Amino acid sequence: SMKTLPKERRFETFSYLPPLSDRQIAAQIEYMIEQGFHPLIEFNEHSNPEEFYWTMWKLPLFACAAPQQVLDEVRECRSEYGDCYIRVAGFDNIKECQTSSFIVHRPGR
Amino acid sequence: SMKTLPKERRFETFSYLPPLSDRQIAAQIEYMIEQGFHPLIEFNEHSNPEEFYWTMWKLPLFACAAPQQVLDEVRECRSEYGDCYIRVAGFDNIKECQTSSFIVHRPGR
Amino acid sequence: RGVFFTQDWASMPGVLPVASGGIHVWHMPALVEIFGDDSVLQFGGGTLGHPWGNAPGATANRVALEACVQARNEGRDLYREGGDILREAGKWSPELAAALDLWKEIKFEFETMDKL
Amino acid sequence: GFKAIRSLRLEDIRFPVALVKTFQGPPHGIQVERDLLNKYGRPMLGCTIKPKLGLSAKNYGRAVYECLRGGLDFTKDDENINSQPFQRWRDRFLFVADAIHKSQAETGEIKGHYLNV
Amino acid sequence: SAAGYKAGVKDYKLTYYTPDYTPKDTDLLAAFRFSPQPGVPADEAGAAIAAESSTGTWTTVWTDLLTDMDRYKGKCYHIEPVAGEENSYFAFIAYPLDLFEEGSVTNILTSIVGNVFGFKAIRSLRLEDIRFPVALVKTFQGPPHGIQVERDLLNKYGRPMLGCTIKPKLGLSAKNYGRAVYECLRGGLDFTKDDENINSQPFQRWRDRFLFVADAIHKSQAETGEIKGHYLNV
Amino acid sequence: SAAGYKAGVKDYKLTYYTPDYTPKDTDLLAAFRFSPQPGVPADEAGAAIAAESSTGTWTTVWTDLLTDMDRYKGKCYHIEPVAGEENSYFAFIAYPLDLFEEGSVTNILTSIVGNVFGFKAIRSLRLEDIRFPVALVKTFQGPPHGIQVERDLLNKYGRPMLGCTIKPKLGLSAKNYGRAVYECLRGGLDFTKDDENINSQPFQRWRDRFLFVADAIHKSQAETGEIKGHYLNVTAPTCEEMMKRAEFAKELGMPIIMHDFLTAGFTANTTLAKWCRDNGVLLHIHRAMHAVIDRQRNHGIHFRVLAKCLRLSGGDHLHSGTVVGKLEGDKASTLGFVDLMREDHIEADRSRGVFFTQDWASMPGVLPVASGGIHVWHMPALVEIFGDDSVLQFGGGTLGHPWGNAPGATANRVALEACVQARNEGRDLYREGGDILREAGKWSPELAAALDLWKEIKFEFETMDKL
Amino acid sequence: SAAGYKAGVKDYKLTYYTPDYTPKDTDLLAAFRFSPQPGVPADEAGAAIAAESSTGTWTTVWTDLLTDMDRYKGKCYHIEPVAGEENSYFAFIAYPLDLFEEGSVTNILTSIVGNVFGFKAIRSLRLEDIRFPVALVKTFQGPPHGIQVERDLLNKYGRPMLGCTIKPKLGLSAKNYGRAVYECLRGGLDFTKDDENINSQPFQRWRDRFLFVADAIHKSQAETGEIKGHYLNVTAPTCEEMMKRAEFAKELGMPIIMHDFLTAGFTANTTLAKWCRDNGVLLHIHRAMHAVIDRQRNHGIHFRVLAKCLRLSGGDHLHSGTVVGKLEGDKASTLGFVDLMREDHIEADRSRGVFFTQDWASMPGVLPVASGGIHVWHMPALVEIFGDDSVLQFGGGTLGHPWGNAPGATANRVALEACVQARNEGRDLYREGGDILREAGKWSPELAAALDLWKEIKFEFETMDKL
């Protein structure tokens, strides 16, 4: 039968799923908090896989207890940087590695 | 007497002949079938000679008996990828080499 | 679990476990359950044996994986709900649906020689 | 192989920390690898190219490109793909590198292929 | 032709069990002794061994049709029950010359014994013999010297040569090692040797042993008028 | 046992003529055509050839008895008179595998053709064929890439490739060389090449040519959108110079170089073929000097032996002759050794000069290159004879076009594609070739100009190298 | 000026036949013997040879006009019929100095003999002689040492040197090889040698032979008080292997190695000759394969050209033939090219086959080596023909002695010294040779045994390679 797979740029974890509802985003942030990871919001004007560094939004939310606190910063970041990709990351400081990472905003087309 | 030869990009085999009529295309596909080669349709947004790989349209027509079957897929590929170059190739699996290869569609200007 | 001695590694880096061999999409929730995030899951025949070829075969596996990771993170039980999570994703991914259909019946269940 | 023993199986070794420290260990290890590849938040996905043996270098890279463009992080040589009459190693390395570049450019994700040395 | 791609799992024996195959002189042949799991027929088990040590995997892949599988596939061409033993068989499998890297024992073993010993459907597997085709044998150097060149180099003819491993296995200093060596060699042995696990260790570093052992060889050879050697473990 | 040493001269045929010997599959077989001196019997002459190309000399030596002569000696196992010719015979001789250094064409030739051609007792000697055993073939690398890998590297499928030797042979500066190259390549040729005797000379030093030619390749490839190449000649006085030149070609990212394997030699060639494999550079082989050796059928070595030796030593292309051009090539013979250099298994066929069945154990084939005195009117015959897996080269047939190089190139490229299209459509190239060319000439002015220029030009002479 | 481009085929003789040309002293001159096809005039055939070995091709190309063709073209300046022979001519062709890469025999041959031998319009072609201009000769190293430096290194003065090829050709182990060598050298021979096809093989790997042979040389030199040598064959599949083998010989302190210059090739040979100079190792050159090329007088290259090329590429010894032994050698011809390889200035002399006067500008001479099917009865003739500056080699003529190697060696050494003494005393070697040998046989039992054994053995056949 068979379709030829289309070409579409992707953005790593969760980018092959339907776009996450804001409730699906909150669920992922809940998982972070429960797991003890520290939320970090970063933004970049480009999504080039070869690059290591995005720009940090403020500082990591080191004692984030509320998903809402994270979501509020994501909103703040967007109003300031709507022309940028914005990604939410969780950081494990014991293993010292990034544990979660997904794009929550893509720029205007 | 003599004319200065113009500069025009070419596209390998048959690209120095007048553009092939759909009957000339079918004749080449008949040659493939008769020769036992397997037809393969590929497309690319660019025609850069240094690149090895184009994108495969579906899978090779491994037991293609009809030229029409090939031509139908070429039509299908065009409706989906009219902005791409489209090339028909024949594959010899015993020598494991591509035996035929010619552009059947060039993108809108 | 067969660990006779306590082993310390004095901060020598870990090695990524790679799960490979005779696995397909239906195995995904079990694999994610067993190995967790720090693993590589490999599908040779389970990609190139997709009815539509390699790229759709790859998308089938990538979608199945991300669906399982999302579900796990949401608190869904991968063991009890794995089939459902896969069916769900199959609803909107034709290439995953094609793979689920193809390998629905395929299991490898034999007596383990290397018992503890 | 001692005559006086019917069968022998080594089950475990405790390596002392003082000996463990005389080794390099993994060139990179898990966390450095995720950082190099920008791969976080889930298992990575790979794929061995098939048939095990028999494909030319160009057909090998073809299969690789199509796999990687579809969403897999890695493809790999089969363990017994080294350098053989049907496919010499340096040709495979060449064609596979091309496949990695094309698929990475299309997907915007880091791609790799374990080239068997 | 390329016979149509039908995706899905087939029995290995449909492709890889070839009881009518007659091995070529360029084929690498392998004899395996195996016991299949209950419910797995011997010919399917033999075919699975042939498949997964050559070209095959667990499900049908379209890429087969890009090449000539008949030319490349391993071929289980004979199975026979082991006389007097329940559920034990010999499978004889032929592998084309093309499958192997020239001059590489590493590659040969990677195919023949790489993955098949851990197959769930097989209880136990033992490789008994391999016929190396002459065309493959010629891609190898083989012994650096071999028997006749060695006798000629050492002037040792007419009887077995005599050696001796120094003991204790581990624990002796370099100087005490050479001492034991000198005394052994002066007494009539042709060779002494490092124990297999004597490499380089805190009690005896390798370069010191090499130094002291060379001295022992010279002294004993000078005294006896016969060529002496000591296998220095590298 | 060691059967007693009796000093003195014996007949060779007592030891070396073995008409009851059946060759092993590991034996190297050779077919010689010889005429004995008056008074020398054919079997003694055949035995002398076997003796002095393997283990023997003119008198009995005691040292034979230290080893196993039966295991090592060459064995003349068959002699047959050449039908219709007085005092001419074929001797077939078997040589044990043990006699030869692995991977060395130099050593093989040193035994088979080292001393026996000058033997007083023989008037003339010509080596016709060698069967290389598969066990020996596997000790060689062979082509760095070979036909299918080359097509894949160059993205060239579906027809013969086209080349062109720059002219004049010698005399052009480096800049004028690159100029001629650019204009040829931009016009539709896949390759240009150094003349075989273009190495490094006062009028044009090699490193300058490499520099200017690389520029020409980049410009023409950019304009045409097709992969271009130029066989840069690395043939040099010494191994060191050869390698220095090969190295710079790689540094420039050049896809292909050339080497004169006979005038440089097999030892240098085998070095170069290994380097090409390790460095991914294609190797075009020029057969300069071969006709000194292979032209006359009474004495020398037939080209088909040299072709086999080159496939073993290593080369991606090898000139095969044209049959129809300015240099000699027997058609039946040519079809024979084209099969020997391309295919994996070639059955014995004396009508095409193939004395022995030859297997290659999956050693890659070599592209035949048809070059020398050919022009557009030859195209249908060339495509007919050689098929798609060949390179057809037009030096004078491009640069001698009335309008210059680029139109000359287009004339050849159009003529080729017209013939390939026609063939694929089922048209008979032999019967319809002229018409196919006239047709294409109707819409290609530059092809029409070429057809006009060379309409009368044929090369039809008696072939010396008859089967 | 650039005289207008007119495309199309012209006769070669319009450009390349220049009967009024007087060669410059910097010109490379070549003498070809040719037979044109019926209907091809001699001057057109001669012009075609000049054209296609220098600057020309089959049709007119515009690129000629970018350069100065008069400066670069080969010039057939003289043609003469071969007296007494139908349809056979000599063409003399001058090539400008500019056409050739300095220090490259490979390049010179690529032009002169690259393509022209296969030309359809020519039935047969044979290169007879080349005059190498002094300005070109000076771009070559030549012999690593040459005759006088070699005698000085080896302390060998006052007579021919004596050698011996070990037999059987192939089949002996390394240890048995050194055994045969020791026994030969201890008996009075200066040298032994590997057979040309002894390289590295299953029955005897090269490094083992080098080891055991070095031991044999030391033992025999210690016993005799004379410098001994053995030509260790470094002929190899690749340049790298060749050098690896040369290197170990140097490491062992071996004074001399050998190389098959034709089967290995000039590029590898020139590399080896330079290395030998830098490392003080003497280089013996074996001419394996030469008779494939040089035997027949209607087609090929005469040996005297190959000898000249070898002196340029580099070699301290070169086999010259025996005239009287088992392999062919015309006496008049041989005396000619022995002069060409030894002397500094050789006058043209057609009666000895020397077409051109050759100067060598003090490039060292090469020792001629007479080898093949010779024994003690040949000694007075060999000393007569070659004189003191030669190496005479007896393989079967030493190892085939009834009592073995050491007495075989003494037989040859006594026979030689008896002949040199007699010659120096004024005795005529031709008329009195048998007597001189009988005399010495009276007090040398081992010479007497040899004289008896080979009394009847002669090699007398018709010479194919007549002048």
Ligand SMILES: O=C(O)[C@@](O)(COP(=O)(O)O)[C@H](O)[C@H](O)COP(=O)(O)O
């Ligand atoms: O050759 C094979 O069978 C595989 O390529 C899997 O192919 P499929 O993905 O087509 O099954 C893997 O290497 C095995 O997984 C090795 O076993 P393990 O990982 O247990 O060492």
Ligand SMILES: O=C(O)[C@@](O)(COP(=O)(O)O)[C@H](O)[C@H](O)COP(=O)(O)O
């Ligand atoms: O020097 C030459 O004559 C050529 O450049 C041809 O030039 P044209 O294309 O101008 O004739 C070729 O090298 C010959 O074809 C060699 O012969 P072969 O291929 O038989 O070895």
Ligand SMILES: O=C(O)[C@@](O)(COP(=O)(O)O)[C@H](O)[C@H](O)COP(=O)(O)O
């Ligand atoms: O293989 C041989 O026949 C020889 O060893 C001679 O052995 P004998 O001394 O036993 O005859 C010599 O190499 C030839 O003389 C070569 O010929 P040339 O010197 O004419 O190149």
Ligand SMILES: [Mg+2]
């Ligand atoms: Mg595997």
Ligand SMILES: [Mg+2]
């Ligand atoms: Mg031990």
Ligand SMILES: [Mg+2]
């Ligand atoms: Mg040429």
Ligand SMILES: [Mg+2]
């Ligand atoms: Mg010899």
